[PDB]
Symmetry: C4
Subunit: 389 residues, 4 copies
């Protein structure tokens, strides 16, 4: 029946699965209608995986594709592609209009959710199968917004992180609990709860969820939100490791104070991601990514730890460079592939492609999953935005 977390498939590192690179096909002479997009992620049912992303109602090449830098507009939609299909117009499936997205399969049907509307009164609508079953209005009237990666479903209920409020100040996230797309309750995030953008969430065992988020205002440490789905409680933490995962960030270990001390810098940030190994009882290893550069969104480096990330300031253990530091690397996202015998968690990388400020913007997506003992290879795009017609 319902999807629930299983022990994960054996693995001790991150190794490459595949890469999608639609705009390799958008050069002079090419014959493809490619889909420029941002905020991609992957979510899976037991039958298939899908690449979800937020489009701009346009293909590249084409006259209208100059709007693809925009965050929010009446053009953007949550769309998806079977995982492994390239991102072309005929392969695209439109789910919901809107400009911030999430999706997750509960074992029976897809829940899709986007936020639509003006900045001061946006509305999240949740589609379950083909019907809009849920609606959740803005509570702080300042850009209601959600994860830009998959939500998590356990035992017929799905858990979605939303936030509303100033991106440069205190903004309190909430956990929405859904059943067939209907919002049946809201869980208050206690503890360290003054920020939490764009959370990447994974089950840590049979009944708990852990989310790795972005503090866009206060800290280069990433917020962590843990959800107890049985008690229906959630608590916020600050990631304690000296290996700070956000971008921009100061030098490792240089934030003086306790785990939950913000640090002097902290403005700005980027969506981050993790993967894990777990039994039905507990998570046994975590895998993290951050940029190569401490100031710019470039490169991707993988790390791992067996420590509890909310309590230990120990540096993370280096796995290696997944994307060279000369290569733009923007968002990363967590996702899980469910299996009949074991589950597998993965990290996806938004390798950004752009012609510059307020010009054409899209990406290539590279996927790494928990398997093996060492990193196998780094990824490139070999797309020069100047060559895109």
């Amino acid at each position: 029946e319902w999807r629930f977390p299983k022990s994960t498939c054996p693995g001790r590192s991150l190794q490459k699965m595949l890469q999608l690179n639609p705009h390799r096909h958008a050069t002079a002479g090419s014959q493809a209608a490619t889909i420029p997009n941002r905020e991609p992620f992957i979510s899976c049912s037991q039958d298939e995986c899908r690449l979800f992303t937020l489009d701009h109602d346009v293909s590249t090449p084409g006259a209208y594709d100059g709007i693809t830098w925009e965050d929010r507009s009446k053009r953007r939609r949550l769309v998806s592609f079977p995982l492994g299909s390239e991102l072309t117009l005929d392969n695209m499936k439109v789910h919901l209009s809107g400009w911030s997205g999430t999706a997750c399969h509960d074992g029976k049907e897809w829940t899709y959710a986007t936020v639509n509307g003006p900045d001061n009164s946006a509305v999240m609508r949740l589609k379950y199968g083909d019907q809009i079953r849920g609606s959740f209005p803005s509570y702080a009237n300042n850009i209601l917004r959600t994860q830009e990666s998959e939500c998590v479903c356990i035992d017929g209920k799905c858990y979605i992180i939303v936030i509303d409020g100033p991106a440069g100040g205190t903004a309190t996230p909430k956990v929405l609990v859904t059943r067939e797309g209907e919002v049946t309750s809201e869980i208050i995030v206690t503890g360290r709860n003054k920020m939490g953008e764009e959370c990447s969430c994974l089950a840590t065992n049979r009944t708990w969820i852990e989310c790795l988020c972005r503090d866009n205002a206060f800290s280069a440490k990433r917020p962590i939100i843990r959800i107890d789905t049985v008690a229906g409680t959630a608590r916020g933490y600050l990631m304690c490791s000296d290996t700070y995962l956000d971008t921009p960030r100061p030098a490792d270990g240089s934030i003086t104070g306790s785990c939950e001390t913000d640090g002097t810098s902290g403005g700005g940030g980027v969506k981050g991601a993790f993967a894990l190994s777990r039994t039905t009882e507990a998570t046994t290893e975590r895998f993290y990514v951050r940029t190569v550069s401490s100031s710019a969104r470039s490169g991707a480096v993988f790390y791992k730890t067996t420590d509890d990330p909310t309590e230990s300031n120990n540096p993370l253990t280096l796995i290696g460079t997944a994307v060279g530091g000369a290569i733009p690397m923007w968002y990363s996202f967590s996702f899980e592939i469910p299996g009949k015998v074991c589950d597998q968690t993965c990290i996806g990388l938004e390798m950004g492609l752009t012609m510059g400020h307020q010009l054409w913007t899209s990406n290539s997506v590279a996927v790494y999953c928990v398997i093996g003992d060492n990193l196998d290879w780094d990824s490139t795009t070999d797309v020069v935005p100047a060559d895109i017609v």
Copy 2:
């Protein structure tokens, strides 16, 4: 087994689902074969929803796409796309040749119906699955024609509204009752029955249907046809609300007389639509659309009422503007999404795109469904027909 009406999913307003906008991809440099079309609608089975429309045997860009303003020709066909697939040549599925269309799923198979033939002796053919099972010839020999939106199936029988006769005078609609596509009986529409074009029909409870139509000759009030599927009877009414829903129309409340008084103006019109909330026993709320302009097909405004629309002259209650008044808005259509637990009704909007009189003509389709408490956002196309190559 058979499809039948269930109580609807909770909702008190109309909120956006998605939008399809194929000709965003028909600009200079684009690589897409887009399908120009008119009279679109949506119909759903328990397995999927589909966007149906009447094409012109041509894609845009292309040399032959200048015929897309035409109402009737030997080129047009009823075609469809999985809902959410963009309207491109490879995504298209052709069902029947013809120039007026309807379709509906009875729980087992699709019934598709079009009218084909010359104006003075056209024939409706009804396809059930892959076979043509039904045929219904013109009875007034003056452009036999049908709904341009989905028909309604209850307990294995489907109900289709057809009309035949002068578009500028008295033309009597008929209800066709079909079983596996075969026309097994005709129901005479009694009462106010001298007009009734392009009806949008929804079940109002377990056994009754209500259709909101266009009086192209006599009144700015919309005809309403109610069908009792158990008794096998149908009766025509005139919508009584001071908030007249057709275009063109006089000022609200200015038609002097009883509910069924036509009014002085009334020539012309546009296909209209409604949505509803219902139990198994009764409809509890209705949602309506009309243009912003009282004279031109521009804009879309949503309204609601808990009154019986055939008896109450009360103004409808404003929900808000779904399409700004500067934006062409032509047909709207009702449709229903069936669910395992509850059904959901929706309104689709044909946002018209054209280069002018007897020039290239098509649309973008925006979908709003019954959910939530307030309208979330208005829709735009951001397509300039001059940019279409």
Copy 3:
């Protein structure tokens, strides 16, 4: 289990289903890779219908599409499209290389068959599902060739007409009996058996098949082959009606002599087709097509009769003009749509498109099926080959 003939759905005429016209999309500015083809036909399983045709390993527009006039080459393949999908490169499915084709579904799997090889030693291969299960070599070493329309399967065995020998002289057809694609026996055609090209075959009741063929050497009357699948016998006849169905042909009734008298002319011909109404016991009405012109492949006119076509010289009864005489019309083909309650037979029309002798050549396909009481409308292409780029 196995497919078998049922009584047909009620109908007394031929009315249009749909039309496919891929090269409407092959004009200046268009964005489609259309598939030029010849010898199209349709065959259906209980799950779907498919348009089969013989391609040339090329799309239009394109530099290599000038070979599309050729009958036989190492380029041609039997390919197919879901019925209603337009004939584009991405929608195409390749089944077998070869230059003469047939296919038919037995209730469990598709049998596909083509002839491949040089003119003097060609080989029919039969594919059952995904495997090549059958092989049948040339027996007269002079262009082994088959129906260019669907074969017929009854009770797990399929029946395929092949011929081999001079196209301008005596060439004896054979009936191949297949089981899971393996040729398990050959049935000798007795009686009037000196010709029989490109047969269109339909079941006439639960256990018999009737094929309407082309005599390319001797007569403007069409050969008819009847197969008794229980006895495993087949006999050839000459169609006796004064309404001669081949092209070219003399004036109606002008062939002096008995039913099987050839007549003075008879050289050349075109593939023809019929449809029918039947019970489980007997065929009750037949529907026929021929060109408008008695000398050129132009136009299509439908006729009907309740007489036995092998014995009665009565003229056929006019139904009407399906394709105007100014419009090229080449092959026609019979096919059957199986249903859960009743079966339906249809005629497809190859509306030919060409730039001239040994230049680009393809078609549009129009489908008419047995339903209703009168012909609804004629078909056009509105494709000017000069406009194809």
Copy 4:
């Protein structure tokens, strides 16, 4: 449940199934995004066959397609197409990044495997369904690499040949045994085991596998590896026939010595293939291919034998020329089509297309299967690389 080898369908020769030729559609004026590729092969489940190949993250025509000569890069991926779909961007499905590939279906799910990484530390990852279940690191740190044709699954375990080491010297192959994509054991290849590139493997009966490989360093005779899946043993042999199957090669029979004598030449080679007839007990006939030219990769000639190829020096028996000697012919690959009643083995031919050294490179694929009594026809491409835009 699990896939296992059945007796093969009756057949005594090789006859053509079909051909895929995507770059016929990559000429001036064409509208297709074709996928240039190398190292193609086919593998089948009981539900469908698929054409697998290694792409270059690019379509033709397009600015980036000049890298398609490369063996190994961060661009290449194992991709596939339903067998019979042409090789276009929208039809493509990406499975794994990497630059050497294999795949095989065990009756329940696909196992896909590629090697990814730098030459000195590459890693094979094995994907089972949607999850990466297996990982196998380089053991000789010199281009770990695999078959470039399908692996073989028997009774829930799959068998994959890998090799690692110098391509111009001794390199020891290993048999990987997988279960749901996890590498559960390695089988040591005993006997003549100093080489064995790019093996084409088929079951020879219910429990044994035979692989025909390429010795790139020592001999124009092809290595043969036999696997006993019950004992879990594998042994290497040298093909003994005077009809040497590799390219380049000396004159037939001119290698003096025993079966396992290398011969004086032997440097270089090409992937080869075979097909067979078998019962559940034993293989009864084998079918082989080699080039027409003894020095260049051109043409394809089929042969057959009933001798044991590891012990008999008898010349093989000529079947005939499948690809003329003037036509480039590069890799060939074995594959099997499973059936409900019988299995069928086939040979695929990579008919190479290239603009020259370190320029655009791809292919057409022709398929021949075991059926009939004589070769039916040879294959051509009719693609001139100079015409590709």
